[PDB]
Amino acid sequence: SLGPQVAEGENVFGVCHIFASFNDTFVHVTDLSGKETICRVTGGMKVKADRDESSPYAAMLAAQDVAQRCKELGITALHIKLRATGGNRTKTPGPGAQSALRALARSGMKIGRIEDVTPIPSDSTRRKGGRRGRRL
Amino acid sequence: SRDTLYEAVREVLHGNQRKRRKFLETVELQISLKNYDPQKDKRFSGTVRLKSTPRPKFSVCVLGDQQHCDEAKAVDIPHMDIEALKKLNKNKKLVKKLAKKYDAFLASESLIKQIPRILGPGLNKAGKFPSLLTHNENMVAKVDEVKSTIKFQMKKVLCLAVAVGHVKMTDDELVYNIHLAVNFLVSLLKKNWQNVRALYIKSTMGKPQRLY
């Protein structure tokens, strides 16, 4: 783990596929292409209580421990491709999006290109749940 | 630990490449020493006895006083009984020469009751240390050490040497002792896992050139 680079003017780029549904937090650093994987950690690794694994604190406890293991190989900059559950279910992002992204802006990393990469359809298979709703 | 052979060890009639010097060359035998420790008491040292004259000759002294005085007058050397033992003790210190005037010695069996005192680090550090692992007895071995008999010693840093004849010497003195300095320098054996590798020719002076 020692990459040869010009010491005083080059930061090694990357990309992170930030998955953010309501029931878990995920962070996943990869190469430029996305094919390999370098430093992955969830909210489940950090916090241990079924209901509060995806909470904004259970999303920030994961992102510091990305950047701990992400500063020992020696990466500085990263591209970004955020999510939200998607498909034929909710496309509004979850509570591990900003508390997972703003945490690594304090934990020794640079920020680059951002967008959404939810799955979205042109149109869909019938959705889980009835005609009559999910009563509650 | 087995060689045999005796197939046809004729053919030293190309041996002019040995003697190139003006003087007569001391022809020899020496196998390189595998299967061996330095410091120990793994005592690999008999005293193999040849038949006819390889001629190891250095100035011998008879320190014996029972049958070793009578039977060491056959070689015929002016015997000196009590002023041979007293000569090495404080006589010639301020006179510039050393007090010996000897070379070889006896590993004492006749005077075995007068043996156990001083003589340790003068002879031992030199390696002229008189033993019966090399026929230093000087009585019947006065007719053998000076002329016939031989050994291979034991020591720390792993070494060997032994003779058979010369290049004065003829084809009678070259091959018929080679028959007795191979049977007897093979059986002498620790189930040595065959140091039987290859046993090399030798003279007085030079560089590498191999044989079995």
């Binding site: 783990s1 990459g3 040869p4 090694v12 780029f13 190469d31 430029l32 292409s33 996305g34 094919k35 390999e36 370098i38 190989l73 290109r113 | -």
Partner: protein, 68 residues
């Protein structure tokens, strides 16, 4: 009894003469080991890279792809 980010050596990536900047980035793969080569698997990536960073100062909304 192993560290998995030793068996990974840092190689380089390039872009064609029609776009401006030549040097994109880097990528990592395992050595010639068992029965797989480090130049056989490394021959079909996709780098979904923009244009702004590929040029001096452009409209950034266009992207591109560049397989090995």
């Amino acid at each position: 009894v192993v560290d998995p980010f030793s068996k990974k050596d840092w190689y380089d990536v390039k872009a064609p003469a029609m776009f401006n900047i030549r040097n994109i980035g880097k990528t990592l793969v395992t050595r010639t080991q068992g029965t797989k080569i480090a130049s056989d698997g490394l021959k079909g990536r996709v780098f979904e890279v923009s244009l702004a960073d590929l040029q001096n100062d452009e409209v950034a909304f266009r992207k591109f792809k560049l397989i090995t």
